[PDB]
Amino acid sequence: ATRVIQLLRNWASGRDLQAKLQLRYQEISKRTQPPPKLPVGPSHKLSNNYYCTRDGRREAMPPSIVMSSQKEKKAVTPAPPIKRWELSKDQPYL
Amino acid sequence: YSTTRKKIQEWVPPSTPY
Amino acid sequence: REKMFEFYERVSGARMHAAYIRPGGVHQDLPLGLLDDIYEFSKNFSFRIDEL
Amino acid sequence: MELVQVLRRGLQQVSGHGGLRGYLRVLFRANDVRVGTLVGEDKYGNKYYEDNKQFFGRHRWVIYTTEMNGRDTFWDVDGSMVPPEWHRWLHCMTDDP
Amino acid sequence: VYDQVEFDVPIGSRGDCYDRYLCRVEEMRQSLRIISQCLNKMPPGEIKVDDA
Amino acid sequence: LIPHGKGGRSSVSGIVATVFGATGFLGRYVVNHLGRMGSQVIVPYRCEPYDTMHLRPMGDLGQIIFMEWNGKDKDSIRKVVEHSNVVINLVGREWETKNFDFEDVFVKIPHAIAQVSKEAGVEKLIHISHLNADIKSPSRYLRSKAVGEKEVRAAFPEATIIKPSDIFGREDRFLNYFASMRWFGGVPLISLGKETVKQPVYIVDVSKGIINAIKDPDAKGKTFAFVGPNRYLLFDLVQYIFAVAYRPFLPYPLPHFAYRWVGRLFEVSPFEPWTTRDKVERVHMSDMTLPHLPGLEDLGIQATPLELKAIEVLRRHRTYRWLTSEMEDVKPAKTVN
Amino acid sequence: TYKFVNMREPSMDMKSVTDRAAQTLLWTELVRGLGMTLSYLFREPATINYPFEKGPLSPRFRGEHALRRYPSGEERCIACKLCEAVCPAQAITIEAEPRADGSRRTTRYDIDMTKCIYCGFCQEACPVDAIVEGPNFEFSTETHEELLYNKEKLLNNGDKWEAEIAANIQADYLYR
Amino acid sequence: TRPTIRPRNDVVHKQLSAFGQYVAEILPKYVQQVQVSCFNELEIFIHPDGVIPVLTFLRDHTNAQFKSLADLTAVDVPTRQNRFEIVYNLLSLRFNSRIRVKTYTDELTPIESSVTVYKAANWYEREIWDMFGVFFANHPDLRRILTDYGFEGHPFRKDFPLSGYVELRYDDEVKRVVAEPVELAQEFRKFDLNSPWEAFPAYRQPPE
Amino acid sequence: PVSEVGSRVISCDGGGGALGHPRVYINLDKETKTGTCGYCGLQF
Amino acid sequence: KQDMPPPGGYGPIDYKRNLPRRGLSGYSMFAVGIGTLLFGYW
Amino acid sequence: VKPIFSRDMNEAKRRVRELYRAWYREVPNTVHLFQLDISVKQGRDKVREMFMKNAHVTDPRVVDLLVIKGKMELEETINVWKQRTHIMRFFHETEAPRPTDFLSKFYVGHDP
Ligand SMILES: CCCCCCCCCCCCCCCCC[C@@H](O)O[C@H](CO[C@H](O)CCCCCCCCCCCCCCC)COP(=O)(O)OCC[N+](C)(C)C
Ligand SMILES: NC(=O)C1=CN([C@@H]2O[C@H](COP(=O)(O)OP(=O)(O)OC[C@H]3O[C@@H](n4cnc5c(N)ncnc54)[C@H](OP(=O)(O)O)[C@@H]3O)[C@@H](O)[C@H]2O)C=CC1
Ligand code: SF4
Ligand code: SF4
């Protein structure tokens, strides 16, 4: 923490550490904080809620089934093929 | 150490004869 | 990496193995004082990775 | 400006008062606020790091068996309850009671 | 929200350990890109699901 | 307490055995066979915690309980007996320490143990003494142990008393000793051959026998004595020792006095001397062959022959050239009896 | 999106060729890295002076357990026993019996740090907020039998730290 | 019905449906049924003998360029004429999508190994062999992993106690660690959380 | 420790707003009352 | 009113590599070296 | 129905005899290389006993499956996989004796 050293240090580095000095935190966030109050949540309205709607687990349904082989025509893909990606734009190479 | 006292508390024969 | 565990430390209460993600979403909300703190670190990390 | 630094070593040498003992046990040096309380002795500090802030100092007579320079001080020795909360930065902004 | 973040995946080439290494580093930088975006768009609201 | 469950590491048993001086070869094994039963033990240390440390695994959480004590203070021995159902004496010493004069070790301590065993209403007391403890001019250990034997018998008469017929094991101070006599050069025989004769019992057998003796209702005041199935000649015995240790074998015939000059020479060392005149008298006196006393087989246990078990005991003495070899190659030694 | 690490290739220009050759013979990047560690010699060391200083923690941090009292001096625990019912390690064992007054209470609440995983589910679970995962984090001990805390032990921990714990919960509960 | 519940796209359900039909027609010597789990996961069945031929084509192009096993799971169920129920995830890259074929197997019938077809399945054959009884034919080297040496009984057999039948402990008299029956302390307290009142009308089997 | 006065039904929480025992209603005046865990009886 | 910690603004963060072109021309290396040699021999 | 290996019994019994040859001959090497101090005979006898343990199995496929599970062990001892502990494990030597006599068991514990 002295100019006699910091100059030599930065020159030895070729990066000039003094702008960051990230290897220590001289003065970060203060620890004590004001009370949170904190968000309410979307469904907390008393005027209109019905769990019969909002429920998700009750929307679970038995799997759709096909063939059940146990009990022209055209060819087709599981999904359309994805496009080839564009190459990084701003930094094409590294 | 063991906590919560005892269990069966089994009875024993009387001191008096017969 | 220790400074990152300071974050798991801060939000989860454990330095690691932070059982914090929940099937329902997430456990407790994260403390107000955190995001600037993450900012201050993240801006300076790159010099470190670079020097590596 | 090495002379000012060595001079800082001197001022620290005087303010510490027999710093040789503190470096014979507490391993040096600079000290600060010297706020205190606890069951015995204790200490406090403030300086220039998020980790080096808020030091401590074991009681010379300790909780019972004598603890001092060149003695086996406990880590559990620190005062129970209040002081760690200021000491771990759980609430360093909240000064020790 | 990876739909809503933008970052560059780093492909290797030769398949030697070295390329994998550069992939490790570059992916570090890219994650370091993600942190920016997440910091800049971090909506207020609840965190656990409403479904009690 | 009434015993519960299958015998096992978690199993309870009524035994709250107290073993004294277990730091030695016996009864580390005896504690172990207690431990496989899961029976509680209160082994108390005189020495230092460190040497005792390997005793710890043997138990199951709360089982083993070290306790600080001294054999000299009366109440100090009142400590570790204080809840013991049974108290067991395994204490012994070959070389007379200064501060523990050779007599008290075999007299006072068993004495205080016996009478405190009386006062605490201890359910059983048990004690060890060498078969040759029967009084003899050579060696003060046979005699001092005879004195504490007769004393505890006079004080806790219903105590059974061990009289082991030389136990051989990996941690032995005996077989390893004559194995290590090679280091000087030869093997000092007072006059070779039948100058003296010995019979041995597996250490494992002695341990199993002791705990079985607590397992035996009949083993009350009876003075048990342990002898191995085979009979051997000291000369052919040592011959078998270097027959398994593969080391060169040099019998070393010797006028009887000079060997004692040697023992006096080696008692000098402040530490723990390799040899002593007391041990010198441990050497040349043969075991008596009396079987009529209650003993090992009376417990129902049968002795494990030494002949298959010396190999593991002495392999550490082997030179690398011979360090791997089947025991059977050595040839079973002939039995005199 | 996709990026080429490497793939970039050296120029064959003679100035560049002599540069790479001189680089090989004269070890430029080598001395570069060497200069780099020289540079890290001059930065201030990161070590904290433990014990004498101790690392930063958080109000939410988890450590030694400790049942704790009402300000009234009454104990909080009411043996709803679901602390047993939610601990994944099932470290907890409880055996309630009625108070002579008729209030619900434990007889032998106990726990064993040997199996506890410090997940803090108990901290969440208690309806009366009795058991609490205390700020203390150091209680390493010699003997296994000491780990297996009894109820009384937990209370003593609750006595030792109560101002401290109440401080953390005071600083934290709103986020709960 | 928006903020909480997942939207579930119709589209993917369509494409997977039709594709399931597509394979269903291309090779129906063995596709028992091509059920689509409603959250977009196709999964055809296979007669146990039919494993290699199906999977083989499953790498082979038509669209089924589903290279790389993700896994070779072995669900167990005590009922059924044959208990163990093997499962194969698969991934196609260019059409970025996953399917999941699966079979069934006797405790004793040796189904063939599928290492050649999906390539990276050599480790799995050993896994399921040592976590189950089931044997894979034409496998170069089944052998134990994820166990001790001896140990014997397969775990994950849906029965078979988690505490097993054994324990090691070091024993000074023999100076060696050794096996010994469990003697377990504290006992695995076994809660019975499961509760009355069916939660799921949308399922629930016929009373029969 | 001493019982709080009442007439009649009244709250209890153990005094810790979202820190005490969950809110309940003791229901006595002249009679001794309650309680949850808080001993806060309402004998008066 | 309520609060929590949404960002108050936060400027952009660095990430791309920034390796300096420290060091210099290769000819200079040989030049200085060889000059050192000849002065040495002299 | 697909057989594992051999069709019908006897074809599988020869397999097991082969296996006995392999084990038996290998055993002295096991005692030598492992520095086991078991009596060189004892391992052999114990082998014969383990071979008696399933000496009543009669199903078709189950026996060949038995020699599958039998290969792996000699497979391990030959590769020095397993160890002194692991191979000494079979002798159950640390166990406390457990007589099968009704009365004997009867005094000892609550039993089944
Ligand atoms: C009149 C004219 C007379 C002569 C004038 C010309 C002088 C001749 C040229 C001088 C060259 C001498 C240099 C010594 C030989 C260097 C070759 C060495 O580097 O071999 C390489 C191997 O490199 C060495 O192993 C480096 C490892 C040494 C680790 C220690 C680091 C030294 C730090 C610097 C200390 C300097 C102190 C002394 C300075 C005065 C192998 O090359 P290659 O296989 O193709 O690929 C690797 C290239 N490298 C160099 C980038 C690694
Ligand atoms: N082959 C044999 O060895 C035979 C032995 N015996 C007898 O059986 C007993 C068991 O033999 P073994 O266990 O090998 O002998 P050990 O020396 O191995 O056992 C004696 C143990 O008791 C301790 N001890 C006894 N008294 C004291 C004391 N006053 N102060 C401090 N420590 C004491 C010893 O030292 P510490 O605990 O302090 O380390 C030692 O640990 C012996 O007494 C022996 O005479 C009988 C027949 C054969
Ligand atoms: S929750 Fe806390 S208080 Fe309620 S029962 Fe479980 S432990 Fe006792
Ligand atoms: S600590 Fe974590 S794990 Fe141990 S009991 Fe409390 S909650 Fe369950």
UniProtKB/TrEMBL annotation, chain C:
[4Fe-4S] cluster 1 binds at H17. Coiled coil: none annotated. Transmembrane segments: none annotated. [4Fe-4S] cluster 2 binds at H17. Core subunit of respiratory chain NADH dehydrogenase (Complex I) which is composed of 45 different subunits. Component of the iron-sulfur (IP) fragment of the enzyme. Interacts with NDUFAF3. Interacts with NDUFAF7. Interacts with CERS2. Belongs to the complex I 49 kDa subunit family. This is NADH dehydrogenase [ubiquinone] iron-sulfur protein 2, mitochondrial. The lineage of its organism: Eukaryota, Metazoa, Chordata, Craniata, Vertebrata. The gene is NDUFS2.
From TrEMBL, chain D:
Keywords: Electron transport, Membrane, Mitochondrion, Mitochondrion inner membrane, Respiratory chain, Transport, Ubiquinone. Its main location: mitochondrion. It comes from the Eukaryota. GO terms for cellular component: mitochondrial inner membrane; respiratory chain complex I. It is a peripheral membrane protein. The keyword Transport applies. The keyword Secreted does not apply. Transmembrane segments: none annotated. It is found in: Mitochondrion inner membrane. Complex I is composed of 45 different subunits. Belongs to the complex I NDUFA12 subunit family. Accessory subunit of the mitochondrial membrane respiratory chain NADH dehydrogenase (Complex I), that is believed not to be involved in catalysis. Complex I functions in the transfer of electrons from NADH to the respiratory chain. The immediate electron acceptor for the enzyme is believed to be ubiquinone. This is NADH dehydrogenase [ubiquinone] 1 alpha subcomplex subunit 12. The gene is NDUFA12.
UniProtKB/TrEMBL annotation, chain F:
Keywords: Acetylation, Electron transport, FAD, Flavoprotein, Mitochondrion, Nucleotide-binding, Respiratory chain, Signal, Transit peptide, Transport. GO terms for cellular component: mitochondrial matrix. NADPH 2 binds at G21, T23, F25, L26, R46, L90, V91, G92, R93, Y141, K145, D166, I167, R173. This is NADH dehydrogenase [ubiquinone] 1 alpha subcomplex subunit 9, mitochondrial. It comes from Sus scrofa. NADPH 1 binds at residues 21, 23, 25-27, 46-47, 90-94, 141, 145, 165-167, 173. It holds the Pfam family Epimerase. NADPH 3 binds at G21, T23, F25, L26, R46, L90, V91, G92, R93, Y141, K145, R173. NADPH 4 binds at F25, L26, L90, V91, R93, K145, I167. Belongs to the complex I NDUFA9 subunit family.
From TrEMBL, chain I:
It is found in: Mitochondrion inner membrane. GO terms for cellular component: mitochondrial inner membrane; respiratory chain complex I. The keyword DNA damage does not apply. The keyword Transmembrane does not apply. Keywords: Electron transport, Membrane, Metal-binding, Mitochondrion, Mitochondrion inner membrane, Respiratory chain, Transit peptide, Transport, Zinc. Coiled coil: none annotated. GO terms for biological process: cellular senescence; circulatory system development; DNA damage response, signal transduction by p53 class mediator; fatty acid metabolic process; gene expression; kidney development; mesenchymal stem cell differentiation; mesenchymal stem cell proliferation. Transmembrane segments: none annotated. Signal peptide: none annotated. Mammalian complex I is composed of 45 different subunits. This is a component of the iron-sulfur (IP) fragment of the enzyme. Accessory subunit of the mitochondrial membrane respiratory chain NADH dehydrogenase (Complex I), that is believed not to be involved in catalysis. Complex I functions in the transfer of electrons from NADH to the respiratory chain. The immediate electron acceptor for the enzyme is believed to be ubiquinone. This is NADH dehydrogenase [ubiquinone] iron-sulfur protein 6, mitochondrial. The gene is NDUFS6.
